[PDB]
Design a protein around this motif. Structure first.
Motif, mmCIF file in Angstrom:
data_model
loop_
_atom_site.group_PDB
_atom_site.id
_atom_site.type_symbol
_atom_site.label_atom_id
_atom_site.label_comp_id
_atom_site.label_asym_id
_atom_site.label_seq_id
_atom_site.Cartn_x
_atom_site.Cartn_y
_atom_site.Cartn_z
ATOM 1 N N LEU A 275 40.441 36.886 27.223
ATOM 2 C CA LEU A 275 39.170 36.938 26.692
ATOM 3 C C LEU A 275 37.602 36.561 27.673
ATOM 4 O O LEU A 275 37.366 36.866 27.780
ATOM 5 C CB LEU A 275 38.568 36.669 25.439
ATOM 6 N N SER A 276 37.861 35.132 28.074
ATOM 7 C CA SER A 276 36.685 34.437 28.587
ATOM 8 C C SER A 276 36.422 34.940 30.062
ATOM 9 O O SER A 276 35.436 34.753 30.657
ATOM 10 C CB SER A 276 36.894 32.926 28.535
ATOM 11 N N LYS A 277 37.517 35.197 30.378
ATOM 12 C CA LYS A 277 37.717 35.719 31.846
ATOM 13 C C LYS A 277 37.237 37.294 31.932
ATOM 14 O O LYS A 277 36.641 37.578 32.970
ATOM 15 C CB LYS A 277 39.814 35.409 32.659
ATOM 16 N N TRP B 98 34.193 38.134 34.223
ATOM 17 C CA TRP B 98 34.201 39.333 34.961
ATOM 18 C C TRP B 98 33.334 40.223 34.537
ATOM 19 O O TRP B 98 32.838 41.359 35.476
ATOM 20 C CB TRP B 98 35.943 39.423 34.807
ATOM 21 N N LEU C 245 29.331 38.813 35.500
ATOM 22 C CA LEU C 245 29.262 39.189 36.502
ATOM 23 C C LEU C 245 29.555 40.131 37.746
ATOM 24 O O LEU C 245 28.666 39.934 38.930
ATOM 25 C CB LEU C 245 31.008 38.333 37.583
ATOM 26 N N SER D 144 43.625 32.274 37.798
ATOM 27 C CA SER D 144 43.258 32.191 38.825
ATOM 28 C C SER D 144 41.962 32.060 39.313
ATOM 29 O O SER D 144 40.674 32.629 40.161
ATOM 30 C CB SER D 144 43.505 34.032 40.031
ATOM 31 N N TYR D 145 41.446 30.735 38.247
ATOM 32 C CA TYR D 145 40.223 30.882 38.090
ATOM 33 C C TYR D 145 40.099 29.063 37.802
ATOM 34 O O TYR D 145 40.513 28.281 37.340
ATOM 35 C CB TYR D 145 39.355 31.538 37.631
ATOM 36 N N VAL D 146 38.326 28.749 38.416
ATOM 37 C CA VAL D 146 38.278 27.656 38.080
ATOM 38 C C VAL D 146 36.753 27.525 38.404
ATOM 39 O O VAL D 146 36.231 26.210 37.347
ATOM 40 C CB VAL D 146 38.918 26.083 39.209
ATOM 41 N N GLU D 147 36.015 28.206 38.166
ATOM 42 C CA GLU D 147 34.789 28.056 38.438
ATOM 43 C C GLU D 147 33.735 29.243 37.237
ATOM 44 O O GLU D 147 34.405 30.166 36.977
ATOM 45 C CB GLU D 147 35.067 28.688 39.458
ATOM 46 N N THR D 148 33.417 28.417 36.789
ATOM 47 C CA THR D 148 32.390 29.760 35.873
ATOM 48 C C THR D 148 30.824 28.186 35.720
ATOM 49 O O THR D 148 29.498 28.523 34.760
ATOM 50 C CB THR D 148 32.886 29.101 34.078
#
Lengths: 65, 330, 108
Positions: free
Chosen positions: C66-68, C72, C75, C103-107
């Motif tokens: 849900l956070s991704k 998405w 952005l 495939s993400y570490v940045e917010t």
């Protein structure tokens, strides 16, 4: 000028935005390759064409392996 | 409430919303997944819905699901999600109950999304379970022919053990999905609808039913780490599916080759025996390190599981650690 | 002019070639020119793109990511502020998709 360089800041902002959009779709693209194809689409080109050529050249590291 | 449950049969919708969409019936589901084995194992980039609907019709007419009303049966149909170039049918698949009544006010789209999420979660686990049952059947069938091949008896026995480790975990988790997850929630909803004096009370009873089944399943944004641990357990199933037949596809062939050598004779098989003395140990050690790896990660799952939620998730630990064989490993 | 340099840079960059006297470079460049000068592609529609974007957002939601999904959506909506937007997006969409990992570490 000075306002002409805050635009360069602002395209750097958007291209880091596009860089995250590239990284979470798990593309082979990095920022530098992305920096080429935006210029290509500024000249105007099918993304269907460019996806085809990228899907070909990525198989050219496989034609020499 | 009287006109809603007779002229449009609001309650039949709930009864068919558990049995089918929430996979509450499973006579239907096992035959459905059986017919959908060769199609969904094939990559889903070339999958289009018209091939799904026609076999779906045979499956629904054959099984118990046939006996309910054709209206709610008609309101059941498949749907797919968007495609990928890495797509396979078990990854992208859905059942979609489309609403043609005014019942949408009590079955709002957010709770339909909840239905979708719980269905996907309960689809992946039912696929991997059948893979495991396939592994067990392969064990029970092939091994009575490999009694005449003596040298594999080590590694073939050792595989037998690791299967039993998975068979336990996949038969206890699937009992926690049986009880308290589809049963306390159903009891709550089933009481608070069958008494209800207001439509609002029906709706607010539906709400908490969905919230409870979100919490009891591992679908939170907080139980995500446990979910990642669980995905790593789903991985080793298909790894074992590879390796077990990776034994047989070299092993069992040689025996027929040996009979062909014997029918010729009515030195080369000496080489075939010699290759086994090299092939066996590395495959054994591969199985050994796989066993170590799997047993390592599952203990870490359980020790995290002890203090995550106070009561609900704690009940999983008693069922999953019956023998206290865990914490006696560490 | 700059377009030809872009084709050179693209071929060099993703193929990893360091030479243009390379005949394989010559074949790939001829492939690119035959690709560009032949048009059999479909023209892009923005609403179909928007349908694709919300479908990806849905698929993020369904997989309990849900956070991704929220990031998405945020952005992509942020990017579409301040045509070429849509073309770059369509490119990025079509190029690759197999996403089952974070495939993400940045917010930030």
């Amino acid at each position: 000028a000075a306002a002409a360089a805050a635009n360069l800041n602002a395209v750097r902002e958007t291209m880091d935005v596009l860089l995250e959009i590239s990284r979470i779709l798990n593309t082979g693209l990095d920022m530098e390759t992305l920096s080429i194809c935006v210029r290509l689409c500024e000249q105007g080109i099918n993304p269907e064409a460019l996806s085809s050529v990228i899907k070909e050249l990525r198989k050219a590291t496989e034609a020499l392996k | 409430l009287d006109v809603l449950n007779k002229k449009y049969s609001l309650l039949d919708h709930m009864q068919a919303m558990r049995r089918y969409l929430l996979l509450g019936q499973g006579d239907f589901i096992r035959h459905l997944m059986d017919l959908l084995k060769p199609e969904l194992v094939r990559p889903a980039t070339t999958l289009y819905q018209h091939n799904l609907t026609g076999i779906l019709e045979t499956a629904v007419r054959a099984t118990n699901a046939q006996f309910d009303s054709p209206e709610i049966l008609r309101r059941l149909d498949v749907r797919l999600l968007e495609v990928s170039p890495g797509d396979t049918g078990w990854d992208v698949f859905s059942l979609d109950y489309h609403v043609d009544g005014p019942i949408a006010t009590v079955f709002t789209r957010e709770c339909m999304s909840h239905y979708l999420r719980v269905f996907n979660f309960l689809w992946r686990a039912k696929r991997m379970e059948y893979i495991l049952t396939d592994i067990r059947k392969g064990h029970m069938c092939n091994a009575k022919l490999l009694r005449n091949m003596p040298e594999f008896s080590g590694v073939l026995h050792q595989c037998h053990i690791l299967a039993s480790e998975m068979v336990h975990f996949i038969h206890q988790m699937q009992y926690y999905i049986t009880f308290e997850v589809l049963e306390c929630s159903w009891d709550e909803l089933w009481n608070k609808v069958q008494q209800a004096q207001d439509l609002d009370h029906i709706i607010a009873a539906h709400e908490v039913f969905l919230d409870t089944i979100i919490s009891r399943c591992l679908l939170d944004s907080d139980s995500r780490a446990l979910l990642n641990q669980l995905r790593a357990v789903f991985d080793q199933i298909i790894e074992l599916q590879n390796a077990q037949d990776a034994i047989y596809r070299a092993a069992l062939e040689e025996l027929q080759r040996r009979l062909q050598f014997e029918e010729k004779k009515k030195e080369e098989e000496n080489k075939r025996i010699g290759e086994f003395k090299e092939s066996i140990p590395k495959m054994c050690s591969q199985l050994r390190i796989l066993t170590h790896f799997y047993q390592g990660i599952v203990q870490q799952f359980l020790v995290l599981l002890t203090t995550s939620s106070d009561e609900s998730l704690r009940f999983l630990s008693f069922r999953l650690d019956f023998n206290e064989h865990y914490k006696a490993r560490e | 002019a700059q377009q030809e340099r872009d084709v050179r840079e693209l071929v060099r960059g993703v193929a990893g070639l360091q030479d243009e006297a390379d005949p394989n470079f010559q074949l790939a460049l001829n492939f690119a020119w035959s690709n560009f000068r032949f048009h059999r592609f479909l023209d892009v529609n923005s609403h179909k793109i928007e349908k694709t974007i919300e479908g990806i957002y849905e698929k993020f939601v369904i997989h309990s990511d849900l956070s991704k999904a929220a990031s998405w959506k945020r952005l992509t909506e942020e990017f579409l502020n301040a045509d070429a937007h849509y073309s770059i997006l369509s490119l990025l969409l079509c190029l690759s998709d197999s996403p089952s990992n974070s495939s993400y570490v940045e917010t930030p």
